[model samples]
Target chain A: NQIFESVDHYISDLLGYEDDALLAATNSLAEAGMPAISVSPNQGKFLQLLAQLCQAKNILELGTLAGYSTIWMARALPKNGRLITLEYDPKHAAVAQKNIDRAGLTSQVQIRTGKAIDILPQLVEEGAGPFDMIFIDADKPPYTEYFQWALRLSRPGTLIVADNVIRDGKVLDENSTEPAVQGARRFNAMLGANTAVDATILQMVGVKEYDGMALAIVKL
Target chain B: NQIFESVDHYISDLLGYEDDALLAATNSLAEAGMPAISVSPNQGKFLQLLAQLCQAKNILELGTLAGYSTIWMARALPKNGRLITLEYDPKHAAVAQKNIDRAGLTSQVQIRTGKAIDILPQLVEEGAGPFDMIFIDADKPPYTEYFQWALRLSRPGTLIVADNVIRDGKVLDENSTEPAVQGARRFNAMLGANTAVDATILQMVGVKEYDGMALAIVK
Candidate 1:
């Protein structure tokens, strides 16, 4: 009862409200939870679940910043599992790679530098496979392209979890079309239209992040 | 500034307090709140994060009454990921299992029969491992044993998460050595003594569950 009640309040306070139109426009229920708080642990837990459920023998992450979440993902994999992470900022990627190495997940995670748009196509051509799971966490403007790419590259039973779909409530406002907002709007529409998969948007309330995450599973 | 203040209040009012002691003894935080009525979703979200971080390939849940949390964990994994949950009551497990299946994760999880202790070892010996994550959410008396069994069966990087560890204030009451409280103490002790892992015990405020949770990474 207490846990349940706590969860209810968290959802209400964080996800159900918004401060700006961009967040509102994205129609994401997740509030803009501050990253400096305890969100890292929350993300850590999220990645673990992704690793487990995807039974992900191989995972490709669209963004790698500071590698906090990457370590969590790497640790969840089986001995044979591998994770490929992409980062546009060489500086950020460098920091994340170091952190990943320090966390001892280097063997499991490989960091690819440069623009994600540039590298994603290569991974597809190389047939890195039916990634059990794929996470899109980069620039929100290119979400549509990334989602499309992942859909093509993934096999049946692949789990694709995209972060910040709600934009903290921006999509709900109707008039807002910030690049990220437009991207999320189109992305959400695409997911709804994709009959090949089952998808749901869950409202998550966290310290630094409050938004709806669009999680979809593709069926062959 | 508002966000920072709100987060601070959250931690102070819910997470950092002697609330767990009250919860363990009374078994309720339903009435405790910041002048309101509601449980903090942050904890549930935290659990979800834990599930994801552990990359829980095959999750063995020790408790499954309502399956609220089970749904969270199930949705986190890919299709091939399996969640085998143990419930003391077959009836409750069945009901929760049904709900879990409805969430479209039936193939990803199995609601098993019998006590967790009896089944835990068997699963491990059979090489069920490398269970990316294990959540201990069952009876309190066996907390220590569950930790031991889970640790032995887990791989090097596996994360061990146990709920209801604080038992309200009674855990430190000195006058109270109830099974759950005593079990939690021993469990925490053993974890601390282990040099191969990093651990953290956070104080939390919630309605039904209080005390604290033990989160550790096996070295």
Candidate 2:
């Protein structure tokens, strides 16, 4: 924990808070009475870099927790780029919309309100897919399903990132019935067997709790 | 530690050691009396995936220890792709050559025997770069120098990965005189200040000792 915190501080000192909008986004969570479980400042920057490195223009996000990560990634989009984020809670969606407006990303970002499971099919039917990148950070019980939708909506070379898969290593309990751990375990196995993508789980620690992020790239 | 080991094992089981050549490459390290300092199987696969994601065509490697990682990245290259790896020890280079030949990557990989500091300039004069990606894993004391060469040889979008930058969190000790730590400390500072690249250090632990890797994408 000491090492993780120290390095995170060091990284933040250099690369984390370059934009005032990121600070505003973090503060908006507390102001809106939402959980402050968004990604750390460093992870938010890392997500932006990943999106930029991949040259992502079209993006999809399964969670919109006050639009914290959504704004981090949407800022990486090019002019004319589009990012559609799904949020199940109307209150959280309202707060995120204000945050997006404050960040001047309303033109690039769209907030869709509905259960992700219910909305993913509509996206497919509406031809809003074949995205260049997809981020999944919603309820853990639906992670495996979210991954399936991500794959269905992906084209070659698409980057798919899923957060909170490690859950303090609870995924190793083979017989555990906890929905979060069970869902993560199933998702990891599915990614392991899915031939359409090259995937790995990167263990992470820092200001946030110890967890792992699933990183996958659709096969070219 | 348990979770790290378990997840590392899971990653290897799923994404690593599937290729027989990788297994052969690991075996060759022991046969050649080389220190088993090659990147782990999962890391090797991760390197390969990074190469694929970057769509690398020309790659420059600062170290070629037994060619294990060399084989991993070279496998990601297109048929016409080229990888030139520098090794200080001729013996290690010879062993790496044999391993590369065994992997049937002889055409795709070239093993250059010499001090990286000396050979890097020769490469520049010979116009060998503008490489798509550069990997640094040589001696620790010259890491900053290697990174400078990596920057000089890079073009926009070039991914420069330097291993052992964290040194088990020893970089935090500013007063430490250990050359490895001193070198990595200076390298991280330089990367932090340099506007030409976007960079971060990823702390890594599993089969190997605790360390960190510096990842930079040239802007």
Candidate 3:
């Protein structure tokens, strides 16, 4: 109870400064039963920073749930910077298009609605390979496939951030070989062994809808 | 009520996965009222990656609180990687020293118990520098001062990461011109004006302690 109380206090203390615009959008989406896959405020800061740091000119997001994170990332772009986000869910993508437009980020973000696996190849042919940053927040069970594909398009200095790789604590329990966890384990090993990238897990709250997130960054 | 319920569901959903040890330590400290620091799990990974990438032999940390972050940074040391951390408070330094020792990082981490303002000068005067990475997580008021001094000590390509620059959005709020916030404003200007470094801020949630941080690499 004491620990729980302390956590509550820390969380509340930060949430106290919630941005009205962002909150309104978050709330509106929640009410519509289509919440965004945004990360915690702190993590949100991290994403925005990456965009700023990379001074990212060309970037890609593997998923766009209501475009919550898309807006955060897109806002960091310079006058002509652009972010291409892929989403398999047409309904969610449609809603995100509306929300992102409402958020004044449509100019900086392009929503590609279709199965990511199908669209990834086309995007790679068009937008991959020289991208400043690539943020993966989509299909979990197919992470192995995603990682393999991401590496193909990654440059030596490119930055790739993957969310939800830590899914609470389920990645390590061998008994629970659920595809997502299993895929994560393989992804972790592949990433850990890679000579071209650096990877680690951050335990963040309020990402993937207030749950903890495992974030990874590639050195390329 | 629905909002609360949603938060709970999200929390429960993530709890279904593995807990990160590094974040747990930071989360523990934040919940204990030590609310002002965190380890960039990615930074830690980046350190290891950078070390291997650059084959770096030396590293430094501007803040060493309980050494949770130091342990992560130390892991990448090449059987011979040297890591030095500076602390303002002797007591906090001692706890970090103890934590580093407990984590078997004692061999890699050297906690200099004293004020960095004075200590940093001596090290630079002695022609000591060329560190591969420098992570800043202490004393917001002297951030600008620290950056100048760090630049003096860094070689080109050295990675310098400064944490907690946003200060819960206070960096942009005109009404809050406290010393720390003021210092941050000047610091951001310094970074913005400089051409030798590429910097960016990374946002995170359940950050546990401080509102946020930034990562900068000296070019």
Number of the top TM-score candidate: 2
Model 2: per-residue Cα lDDT over B1-219, one tens digit each: 666788778767765655677778788888788898998877777788778878899999988988999998998899999999999999999988988998999999999999999999999899999998899999888887888888779898898999888777788898989998998888888878888887777777667777777788888
* lDDT string, candidate 3, B1-219, tens digits: 233333333333332122354544555465445644544444445445445444457887888876776777777677778988999887678767766766677787799987889889987988768787787777888888888888888887676777766665566655775887777766766766667775644433332333445566676
The lDDT-based order of candidates, best leading, equals: 2, 3, 1
What is the lDDT of every predicted structure here? 0.63, 0.86, 0.65
Q: Candidate order by TM-score, highest to lowest?
A: 2, 3, 1
Query: Which ranking of candidates, highest DockQ first?
Result: 2, 3, 1
What TM-score does chain A reach in every model?
0.81, 0.96, 0.84
Candidate 1: residue A19 lDDT (0-100): 27
For all the predictions, what are the DockQ values?
0.04, 0.55, 0.13
TM-score of chain B only, all predictions? 0.78, 0.96, 0.79
Clashing pairs in 2: none
What lDDT is reached at residue B45 by model 1? 45
**Winning model by lDDT:** 2
**In candidate 1, which residue ranges exceed 4 Å CA deviation?**
A1-42, A45-49, A52-57, A66-83, A90-114, A166-182, A185-207, A212-220, B1-219
lDDT of 1 by residue, A57-170 (tens): 888888776665566667668878999989887767766665665566768889999898999889989988778888888888888789888887788878888877766556
> Under CAPRI classification, how is model 2 graded?
medium
lDDT of 2 at B198: 79
Q: In model 2 chain A, where is the ten-residue run with the lowest total lDDT?
A: A11-20
After best superposition, candidate 2 residue B109: deviation in angstroms?
A: 0.6
Query: Model 1 residue A69 lDDT?
Result: 57
Whose lDDT is higher: candidate 1's or candidate 3's?
3
